[PDB]
Structures are given as C-alpha cells and as structure tokens.
Symmetry: D2
Subunit: 478 residues, 4 copies
C-alpha cells in the first residue's frame, strides 16, 4: 500500500538530487530529504516507456510468441513499466474494430500500464471518420501509416497527404514506417531471381537509400500539410541524417531509434548459420555498417533523435524457419522490450555519450511529452504515477536468451555485458520485480487513454497556421 524509497538519488530528465520517494495508492505523494526500500548509492528513475511493441501479432504466417502477459512481464524485468502497442487492421478492415480486438487481447493479460497506436492501413471517408472517434472516445492520439509493405499496408503519397491532414484536424501525431514499398518489392524479385534466398537478401533488397528516400518524402508531405511527424524504428545513418537536418531546418519531426539499431548491426545477416541471420530480420533491416550503433546513439544524446522503442516482435527459431528458402516468407521482428534500458545505459550512458538525465528523457520522458502522458509518466514528482525503477549503474549484467524473461528462444544482444541493472521495478505503486522474482498477476496493468493536441508538438504547429499561411500580393488586374 505504502512505499518509501530511502536514500536514493532521484533522477529526472531535467535534474537529479538525493531525495526520498513516498508512494501511496499508485501515486508519488511526497518528495524530500508500510515497506521501506534501501536505495542508498542507487538511482531512482521513472519507469521506461517503450513506444513501439507488437505483442502476439498475427503478421506473416503466424503470431509472435511474446504476448501481452509475458511481453509485459519481460518489460518489467528490464525496467520498462509501460508499452505502447499497435492496433493493426487489414485493408478494408475497421480501425475501431482492430482497437477493440487489441484491447481484449491486452486488458486481461498486461502486467504493466499500456496504451495503443492505431494503424491507418487504407483510406476512405469511413477511415477518416473512425480516426475522429478513436481520438474523442477511445483515447488515441497517434496513427501509423505505411510506406512499405505493398499490397498489405502500403499507402500512396496522396493517401499520406490525406492521412496527415486528418491527423492535424483531430490533434493526433502521424507515425510513418519510412521505406519505399515499390523498391522493396522489385528488389526482392531481383534477389530471388539471382538465387539469394537467405536473410542477406532481405537487407540487400532494401539498402538504406530506400529508407532515407521515404523518410524525406514523409517529412516533405508532412511539412506541406503542417502535420507533426514521428518516424518509427530508425535503422540507418542516412535516415537519421535526414531527420536531423529536417529538424535543423525547423520541421516538426521526431525520430525513434530502437534497441536493435543502438545495440547491434546488420553484419549478422551474413552469418554462416541460417537461424542466426534470420533472427535479425526486420523492417527496415539492421545495417551492415558497424559504426551505425555509435552514430545513432550520438544523435540520440544530442536530441537529433528523441524517443526510444524496440519494435519487439519476437518469433521462435522454428517460427522464423517459415522462410528458410525464401527471405520474404521470414516473419519480421526482433527482441528488445526487456533489454532496451540496459543496452542504452551501456552503449549511451556508461560510454560517456549522454547524462543519466538524458537517458531518462530518452527512455521515458520524451515519449510522455509526445504522446501526451507528461507529467503523469516519465517523471518522479508529486502527483505522477508511481512507475519507478531502482537502478544500479555500478553493477553489471550479461544478456542471454538462456537467462532473459522473454518468450523468444534467441537474443540479438546475446553475450552483451551491460552496466545498469534494475534491482526493483515498481508498477502502479506496487513492487512487481525484485532480484529475478515477480510480484505481478495478469491484468494488473491498465490501459491509459491519451488526449489530442499534445502541447509539446502542437503549440508550434498551431502558430504556423496563424502566421505561416501566405497572403496574396495586392495588384491591379492586368
């Protein structure tokens, strides 16, 4: 019922100090200098917000083995107290129907708080209306549109134009999967026609130019409509370089690198054992440039990239095996939900690239601001939800598929020694993870709704309507 985190160092996005945290009924009630936790010499961080998960997802052939129960269980064991999953309807399928379906899958299963993005996979007047209802009635402020996945989720530039316009009118952010779907389709034919059936052909048919082209296109469509943009799972230096320069030019665009692209690379597609390479297959692919994790982390520290996801969409080895003779038939997706925090602490904080405060912003706070959850989440303050992690920076931890809490039998961070270990995870004011032991039950986590027009992204969009709308030049008629 009551928690007292004592002698710990409370670390937020803006500031850190030595203070004590009094938690009551799921909320931080006090800060200042029946259970007491000794956090001396340790860090008291807001719980991680993973902005990108795909739990139990019927994708291509099958569903991902990490479901909303085990996936959140694994999230909590890693320091992440909130996931934002995607409600994906089929072409011609209802958006509200997909949202309700995804809720019934998650509500009784989830162990930590969660919310939902909704994908606009096709376009009509019916989609246009369903978007407004999801914002007003269901608590949705984000919509994902696909530039990749031809004949599955892909939309044209006109449909991107329309979808962004609608996002603007109803106060939602636009999310885009930036890859040229026409090039990935024609490229995949070429690779198979050349006899490259392995996972290396997956990356080879989608070089980073394809990712970067679509990224700039998304940015250009969004800028022409004055709609705030969010670029999901940024994988390449080129795509990141585009987002960085766009923001430099004053475009309202935000980049989300994932654990995968910050912790490992795409050289693993060329690995001699098929299963190793197949377990790295996702969209966009991991890049065969070993200096990518370094570059992506650098921009993230500098706020050129701002939020962090995992794109967690895990498949077993035998599940991945569905594309053993055809790389297009491999279920796309990798692990990340559990290890995100540690991977970023090790590769980002311990490496000297960013503060502990930047780490908080990058794993929690920036997500809260963008998806309108601040300061309810992403902050340890009076009134905020008690999603708290007691973090030991000094201690080490080895990532292994034999020791992790994910359902997948493979880890892309296998063997990685990470500084920063979550000793205690607190979700909704209740200790749910402590030294390998869970204190959670299914359905304890709750869906939390989000309001439109997030000030962090929309306040400067609204001014642009007022003052960047052009006016005619007064002339005499010819």
């Amino acid at each position: 019922s009551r928690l007292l985190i004592r002698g710990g160092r409370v670390v937020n996005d803006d500031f850190s100090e030595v203070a004590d945290v009094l938690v009551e009924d799921g909320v931080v009630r006090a800060l200042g200098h029946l259970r007491v936790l000794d956090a001396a010499g340790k860090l008291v961080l807001p719980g991680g917000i993973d902005t990108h998960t795909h739990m139990q997802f019927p994708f291509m052939g099958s569903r991902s083995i990490d479901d909303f129960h085990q996936g959140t269980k694994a999230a909590l064991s890693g320091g992440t107290t909130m996931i934002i999953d995607f409600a994906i309807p089929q072409k011609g399928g209802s958006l509200i129907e997909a949202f309700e379906t995804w809720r019934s899958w998650a509500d009784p299963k989830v162990c930590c708080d969660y919310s939902l993005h909704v994908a606009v996979t096709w376009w009509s007047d019916q989609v246009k209306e369903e978007m407004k209802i999801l914002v007003q009635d269901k608590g949705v402020n984000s919509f994902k549109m696909f530039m990749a996945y031809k004949d599955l989720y892909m939309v044209t530039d006109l449909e991107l134009y329309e979808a962004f316009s609608r996002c603007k009118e109803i106060g939602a952010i636009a999310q885009v999967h930036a890859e040229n779907g026409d090039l990935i389709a024609e490229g995949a034919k070429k690779m198979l026609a050349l006899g490259i059936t392995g996972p290396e052909g997956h990356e080879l048919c989608r070089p980073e130019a394809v990712e970067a082209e679509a990224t700039l296109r998304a940015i250009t469509i969004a800028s022409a409509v004055n709609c705030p943009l969010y670029i999901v799972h940024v994988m390449s230096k080129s795509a990141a370089k585009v987002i960085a320069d766009a923001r430099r030019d004053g475009k309202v665009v935000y980049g989300e690198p994932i654990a995968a692209s910050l912790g490992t690379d795409g050289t693993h597609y060329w690995n001699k054992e098929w299963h190793h390479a197949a377990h790295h297959v996702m969209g966009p692919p991991l890049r065969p440039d070993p200096s990518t994790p370094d570059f992506l982390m650098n921009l993230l520290a500098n706020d050129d990239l701002t939020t962090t996801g995992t794109d967690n969409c895990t498949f077993n080895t035998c599940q991945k095996a569905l594309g053993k003779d055809d790389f297009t038939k491999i279920p796309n997706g990798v692990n990340g939900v559990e290890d995100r925090m540690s991977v970023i602490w090790e590769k980002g904080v311990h490496s000297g690239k960013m503060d502990e405060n930047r780490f908080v912003a990058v794993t929690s706070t920036n997500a809260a601001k963008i998806f309108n959850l601040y300061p309810r989440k992403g902050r340890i303050a009076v009134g905020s939800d008690a999603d708290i992690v007691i973090w030991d920076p000094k201690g080490t931890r080895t990532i292994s598929a034999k020791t992790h809490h994910q359902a997948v039998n493979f880890n892309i961070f296998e063997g990685m020694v990470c500084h920063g270990v979550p000793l205690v995870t607190i979700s909704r004011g209740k200790v749910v993870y402590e030294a390998g032991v869970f204190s959670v039950t299914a359905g304890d986590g709750k869906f939390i709704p989000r309001k439109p027009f997030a000030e962090y992204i929309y306040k400067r969009i609204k001014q642009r309507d007022r003052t960047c709308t052009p006016t005619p030049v007064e002339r005499a008629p010819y």
Copy 2:
C-alpha cells in the same frame, strides 16, 4: 569555304593556348602557331551546346513564340551553336510519331546544328519497344520522364523504375523533371482556395522541399536499377545539395542548372506588376532566396553540377495573360537561349568562381561527353566540327528585350551588364553571326544523331553490373 582564325587564344575544357584555327568544309583541319579573321587578344571557344530548349511548343493553351528558326537565330547571336530540344508526345501518343513531327518542324527551320531528347510520358510494352527503335534507328540516347505535371506527363515510381531499366538496357541516359506532382496539385488547390491567384502562388505551392524530395527519389530509383541519371533545370539550393551529395556517395547522376537559376531569382514573383511576375513562371519555379544564383554557380564551378541549359520556352506578355486570374493557367517557361553564355561568363568567370576552361566544359564540353557528341563538338581540335565563337572577355554588353534577337517581348535578365561578348559565331564552318548581322538561311542547321552507351557515363555503370552484383552466402540448409 576556308576560314583562318588568326592570333586568337584557343580555349578548350582542359587547356588553352595561343594558336591559329584552319577551318575547311565545316571541320577544323589544322591547329598551330579564303577569309582571315583577326582574333588577336580574343578567345576562340567551342560553340555552346544548350542541352534544354522547347522551341514552338504547344504546351498549355498555346505554342511558344520562339520557333526553330528564330530560336536558333537567337542562339547563334549569343554564342550557342547547338540546341537539344524535346520531342513530347501526349499520354497514349506514339514516341516515334512525336520524334518525326518534331523533326519536320525543325529540319527546314533550324539555323544551327541540333538533336532531340524524347519524353517518356506514359508506360507500356509499346513505349518499351519504341524506345529501342529511337536509339538504333533515329539516333536518340536520352529520354525525359516527368515526376511533375499530374494527368499530363506524370509517371509513378514503378513506371520510373521501369523507364530507367529500359534506358539502361538500350544504352540511353535517363532525364527527369524532379518535382512531386501529387504535392504540386494539392498545393495549387490550397493557394487558389486561399485566393492567391497571382504568380506568387506558383512558387508558394511548390517550395524547394518538393523539388528536393523528387530529386532524391529519382536518384534512389536510378541507383537501385544502376541507370545513369540526369536532372534537368535544377532551380534550388536544396535540390542541388542532394545531387552534390549523391555524386559524393558515388551515384551516377548529373545536374543541369539553367541560365534562369544562375542569373536571376524568384523574388520577382512578388513584383507589383502582374506581367513582370508572370514572365518568371516556370517548373520548377525560380527561388525567393537571393543567394541561389551564387550557390548554384559555385557548385557548377566545382563540378557538383556539370552541364547548362536554358529551358527556353518563351511566351509573349499577352500569351502569358491566359492565367491572369489563375496561376495554373499561365504558360510556363522563360527566356535564356541567347543570353546563357554571357550570363554565365559574367556571373561565373568574371566573378572569379571558374576558369575560362571550366566555362567551356560547362557550356559545351560536358554536354558533348554526356550525350555522346565528344569530341565532334565541345572541342576545337583536328577533326571536330567547326562550331566556333570568337569571344571578347574585356568588352561589356547589356541584355535588353529591346535589343535581343529572341521573339519574346520580355527578358528576365533585363538590364544585366555582362562581360563576354560574341563578336563572331561560326556554325558548320560558316560565319553566321558578326557584329549584329546574320549570315544564315533557314534549314542550314542539321540534325546530328547520337549513339548509345556514352563511355563518359556508361563505362562505370557496366563495371557495376560485373562487380556490384551481390552473390549468395554459402550455407547449409536449415
């Protein structure tokens, strides 16, 4: 019959020296230290090759007043001895039919040598075949595809993919008009709905982001197919910046800035008199950034941009007036064919940005190499065609619509004082322009055919097939 240019300084792309030029039967027969021309203290340059003209073109509502006779007459008066015009078929129209039509318009009219680009305005198996015939039988090695002009010339990314693939197979270069046609259409609705009916709305509906987006897309499609790319009338810093970085990354792409974007800007769209602003309307628009001419010239000097055109598509004031209440109904196109050389000499050579040798490369030689006309044109050497200009760098010249030789009653370089005056223009070994006086008759100029697989662009494309084609990773079956 015989010409002896004496005491002149012969300036090529690579080298310049004091030498005498002996011309016989239209060909330079000798170089070394019945008519003799005193070129002492003056420059002997290869005649300009304008890579981009649209003479007597039935565009939107009407035809351009500069036809193949007056347009070439004006070209010769400015130092340009060759034009490469565009054969534009309508959607559903035959390419060979358009080529033959454009030939019958030009052949009896042209005063200087010429050739033709052919536009791929739609896509089928019939277009696919007609492209091969134009290369084998008609002497065409270049095809223009449109990313702009929706419902008129626009093609999709798949059609760009296919059109580039065909250009590669038959040994032709791909030309692209890089502007997002979907954005220009939706943008134009917005401007008129806001009541901006003047020429300023033409630029406002197509900001340089739109040009730059399509440029990168073209480059990305071309790079994925391994097809050499040529970007016509580059207008913006952003689009030029994309081409520069693409070439830096090793992409086979060439940029063609035009006289308009090197000599003037787009601030003139905001001019108080409608006709002034309307006479600057073209696609892409001139940019409202006064530092554009400086930036474009800089890259041109550095070979980031390589060739020069004019996009000469001139309309009278009353012709332009067709869009007096609707900027979309204004015939697009500006002057340039005559003034190109002087504008570039003044803004490029006299300003200290480039050599006289770079000027030759940039107005003649680079065009020859790309369109397979080197060393027949773009060079003063034994065997080369006698397209020669005696050029005075020291003397000045004022550009005015009241004194020029173009049919258009307006000049976008009006009032510009230019160093570099063409004293004598020699076409096909015959003096055709001398101190304001013409010595030409209609049909004197001749169509010159071009062969496929230009070594300058294709030799390194052919190697990429051989060594950049990926190979499978030898693995045991799972």
Copy 3:
C-alpha cells in the same frame, strides 16, 4: 512582502499549465489551482537570464554608458531579471583583483540579481592558482579566453590547451571568443591600406571563415583535453554550423547566439550614414547575409544552439565617433539587454519556430543549468527564487531608442514591432517594473555565487575520464 499571481498560465522549460503563484520573502512558496496581480490570459515565465553583458566597461578609449544601475534597470524593463557580466583583467593584471573591482562597481548599483564570468587574458602559474581561488571562495564556475584581440587579450593554442585543462581540474566551464586574432590584425592592415576606413572594413577584414576556423579550433583543443566548452556571441551560419556538427559528433560544446545576431544583420555596415554603420560594430561582426537571423533562430529552436546573451556593450554616437577615420578605433559593442526577450519572442515564438517552453529554456533555463543556477533560477517552482515576468503574447510593442530604458542613444532593433510585452517584472519577490514605471532602488540586486562541476555539463565529462581513457595493447617486446 507577499505576492499572489492569479489566473495566469505558468510556463516552464518542460511544461506549462494554468496555476497560481504564491511568492513570499523572495521565494515561490506555493503553486496550485498582501498584493494580488490579475494574470488571466497572460503568461507567467521565469525571469530572463542574460549570459553576456559588459556594463560600464573601459574597453578601447572609453567606457560603455550603460552602467550596472541603468543597465539592470533596462534589463528589468525588458523581462530580464539576471545578468552575468565579465570581469576583464589586463595582461599581467590579477584575476581576483579584477573580480573584486567589478564587484564594487556592481554591488551598490545593480537592480536585479547578477553573477560574474572571469576572463583569462594571460597565462602563468599565478593565473593557474587564481582560477582555483575564484571557484572555491568567490563562486565562479566560468572563464572566458580570447582567440581574438591580438596584444590585448589573445592567447595561443598552447595557452588555450592549458587554460582548458585548468577549467577541467577545478570544475569550471570554458568560454571562448572564437575569432582568429592573427587574421583580424593582418586583415585590418589590408583594409586601411586599401583606404576602407569605414565600418564596412570591420566586417570585411573578419569574414565568417575566420570566426568558423577559431570555433572549430576551440572545439578541437577542448575535445582533446575533455573540457566542456561554451562559445560566446555566435554571429555566423558557418560558426553555428560547426557547433551543431560538433555536438552531433558528441563534443561537449554549447553555443550562445545573441539578440543582435537573431534580430538584425550586417548589411547595416554598408549604410550611407556613418553613425548607423558604426552603431553595429562588434566582435564578431554582424553578417551581411540577410538569412542569418532565420538560420540562427532555427538551430536555437532545435537546441543546436542552447543559450542566449546580448553582449550588451553600448556606446553613444559621439563615443563611437572615436573611430570616424579608422574602423579599428571604433568602440565595439551593441545594445540588447532590454530587447532580448521581445526580439526572441517575435522572431522565434510568434514565427512558429519554437514553443513558449523552448523560449523559457532559451532565455533562462539552459543558462541556469550550464552555470549551475538551476532550479534556483530559470524555473517557477516551490523553492525557486521569485524572478518572474507576467508576459502578454497577444499585445505588440515597438522598439525605439526614443522609448527604451537603455542609456545608449541608438537601437539596432529600431522600428521593430515585437509581440510579447512584459507587463510586470518581479525581482527577488518584489514588483520592480509595471507598465513603464520602476519600483527599484540601487543595490537591491545581489551577487549570487555559483558552484563548480555543474552536473548538466560535467556528469558526462567525468564518465569520459573513466571509460574513454585509452589503454595499452599487450605485446611482447620486440
């Protein structure tokens, strides 16, 4: 004694909400939803922190007319409640002596809170020691070194190396004036030898390449020593572009653009009236590129540049006249202290480039974090000092030397219409400015000391010692 700001919208760096502010004994004591101020429909912002002023400074020939009383009076009338001035010793002069001198000038005069940077104008073991005392005993955490001003303040690269090393050891940030002092000296000879004695020669002898070169050098020296860097009065796109890319590469460097370079340009050096041009003379100069204010503001909004100063160093027209026949004899410095906030609100917030929250960070909060004043200043929170401005974004205001509160008889923002008017300025919990009327007395403002090792800049520097220190490669002896 007690202030109650009611119905206002409290705007911080991270967040804004409708709340009431209870101020008691100079400190914000409460927040939540004998004098009451109606702030309905208005903004409640933390008072501006100007990071760069030079009040009553005996520079070149004379002293600046804006002294610590009138200068702070003017600061408060503009929304700035704190100034950080510079204690400049002469070559061979004591640093502690200059600090004490500058304190005795300011303490009885200042109307708002203040602190001091100290300049390292020469190097020895005595300077090395005096730096440690200023940090331990005097509350200094910042030192300015000069790359410009030969034979006056300039230090060599070795001395920059040593000065940065000392800043690191004692926990202070290094400030640098980035301009090549050797080039500015040789350049100034050339201009006068050419007969350019006017203010245009001041800019012409120091093109932005000179500023950019020194900026990169400073960054390189600082990076090699692992010392946090601060670049004062950034004036050019090139210098800003260097800082932006440096931070992108993970260098600990911060950029401070000034009101002058955000509100006006350097085209004014070419103005027909001498006094106009002379009143724009400073180091580095304002740039003759009209698009500079736009570019600098853009990066500032994006956090590529982070803090804001004014370099306020104002001279009367007749004072500036000392260099009427020799631009080197013109007292360098321009106005800014009063107008900073409004200039940035108009050019930055109202233009749609940044949030109101970003504006707070950029005029106050980021300064606090860097110079270790957060959250005591730059934030409206329980415990923070009551430096508060009631700000009207809707209302307008014209800047004029005839209506401003600065001692200088000239304003470089003359005629600028600015949105964002300070209705009420609160300093140390006391209303000191209200609708043109002052409620302050001399010496009311107080010097506030700063502690070393500011977590915002040093926490990631300290990690780099631990993990970026190289180790030998274990080898057998040859």
Copy 4:
C-alpha cells in the same frame, strides 16, 4: 629509337579510343588508326605522376632505404614514370642549398623523370628571397609548409600567412601538412605518461579532429590571402570532408590522398605484433575507421579530392625498431611508390567507382595541370613526352614484400590481389620495364623544371584580385 604501340586502346583523362602510338626520340610523334609492341586488348595510359615521395631522407635518426635509384626503379615496375620529391632544409638552413643537395642525390641515380617541391621550414627575409630564385632560376612552383612537427618544421599562423602571400606573388602553389603541431606534442606526452609506448599511441595522440582542424585553418589562411592551396597526404574522412566543402564554397584548394589511405586503414596499429603496427606509422596516421578507403576513393572519383601521391618514405623493420619503447622515436613513413597504380585500379576502377579516364586524371593528368606539366606529361598526344604504360585491366597481381621491387622488407598492401598489371613501362620513349625485367641505367631519368603561374590554378586567382578586392562606401565625413 622508334616505338610503335599497335592495336592498343589509348586512354586519356578526357577520352579513350583505339589508336596506334608512334614514339620517336622520347616524344609521341603520331597517333592514328624499329620495335613494334602488340597492345591488342590492352590499355595505353600516360605514365603515373607520383606527387609525393621522400627518397633517401635523413628524417628522425636515420635515412629511408628506398633511394632515388631503387625508388624510381620500383616506381617504373608499378607504372609510375615520374616522381616529385621534397627538398627539406633544417630550421636556419638555406632553401637553395637543400634544393642543390637533393639534386646531386637524385640526378645520377634517378631512372625516371622527376622534379622537386621545396619546403619552407622557417621564415625570414632570406627565405622570402630564396623562394623567388627557386621559381625564376631553378624551376620550382611549389612550396611545402608544416603545421605539424613542433621544433622541427612547424610554423605559426602568421608565418603561414606570410608564406602563402609569397607563394602568391611569385606564382607558386602552397602545399601544407595539415596537423596541429601543438596538440600532437601535448598528446604524445599524455600517451607516454599513460604508458602507451606502442604504435597505437601514435594514432591516439593525433585523432582526425587534429588533422581536420589544421586543414580548415590552412584553407582559411589561404583564402584570406587568395593563395592556391594543396593539402598533402589526406588521411581522414573529416579532413577530406573539409576540403570537399571548401571547394564547394569556391575556395581554391586541392586534396592529395595517398595510396596508403586508399588501400589500407589504421586498425593495423592495434596488431598484436609490434613490427606490423610500426610499419604503418606515418603523419597523419592511418585511420582506425575501416570505411575510410571507401570514402576517400569516392570523393577522389567525384573530384572532391583530385591528385594522388604515396608519401613513400620506407624504413626497414630494424630501422623502425628505433622507437620500440617510444612511439615518437619510430621513423615515420610507409611504402606506396610501386603499388599506387594497381591499388587505385583495384579499389577505384574495378570497383566501379570511377572510369579508366578518371583513373588517368587521378594518377597523372591532374598532377600535371596543377604543377604546370600539362600537356607535356599526363597525356598521350602529339608533342607530349613518351611516358607510357601498357596496362592489362583483365589480369590480376598479388602485392607482396617478397615479390615487389622496393628496398623495404615490408608492404602495407601485403596479400592484396589487384586487377590492372603494368606489362610494359616506357620512360623517355625507351622501354624500361617489361614482364619483371628492367632495361634502365642510373641517371637515365632527368630533372624537369616547372614554370610559375599554372593556368589551371592561377587564372581564377588572378581574376579575384581584379574583382573581389573590396572598395570603400562613399560617405560624408561625420
């Protein structure tokens, strides 16, 4: 006496065609379609010009084992028919004396034609005068200045300013070794104080930021004086990126990457065997970024970098051993003179990055133009010197220290399989290398003098004096 190269494909910088070469008395006398050489299916290229060698150089402790006889013998065996070595005087030593000394070492030894750069290692009025004599009387048009090597060759920014000014007045190009000598000295102390005595400390004390900083500085000093700049042995992406952008901005600067930085990297400094790492030690160091050779080659193909050297300064294993316990005492320098052509053909031409024509420009022609040797060298034309290589692109060749013709017992390209084999090398119209066999004697090669004001670099510098010199703004006296 007479050579007839038959059925070969003559490849120049601008053009290639099937033709026959008639060589008489050391000069190409004819081109068109007692010894005849069958060059069918092979390439006829101009002989390589290596712009950077240091034969038999008393550097640090000893002299390099490759002397002017064996070094040129090795050059010819690789396809290089000309070397341009450096005459390095000591501080206080005469420049003309060093030039004459270097001539007496080379004249009786050299097997191929050569010329000399002269280093300005110190500055006075005596150096100032000696520079003019070397240009007028000795045939020197290039001077190397050092930003690195403190207390040995280093000069200050003022001395760089003066040295560039003199280069301009006498019509010579300025060469600079761009590395911050103050940082390399302080860095080297730090590494040894940390106990890093191996070759890895050589690179670690000079990260590429140091190289890049000095490069930009050199460019800035040169641009302020209007003196043409040449940057020797470019090693890093950063330094190359600076040169590329400088040229893009219109600065007259040329970059010279070397065989070492195009063929290998600096990861070899971390090799477990000391001798391996020591044999890679040079200034600036090879970079620990494996993607460097790729990036440098890319820019070279694009003309961002233009010429090619080797910095050939070879030491035996036991010679290098002088710094076995102190990396500062290792004789700096690596091999390259022989393998340059093949390394560049393999990594540049065969890889599809550049043409065969670009290869000619990059190994020969561009050097000729810059150092005023065109078209006498770098071109196969009537009148040009018969420095010719019959080149087989189809055939392969393995580089090994056991099979090469250099005196050094180590090769940094060891094991590299290279396409492009020199079958026949012709020097001064005489076959000197054929299938492993030499037909040369010592002193056969001859020193060839160079004239000042090379049109390729100076024609646009001279215009800048005329039109970029600022003029006063006409004003009334205040």
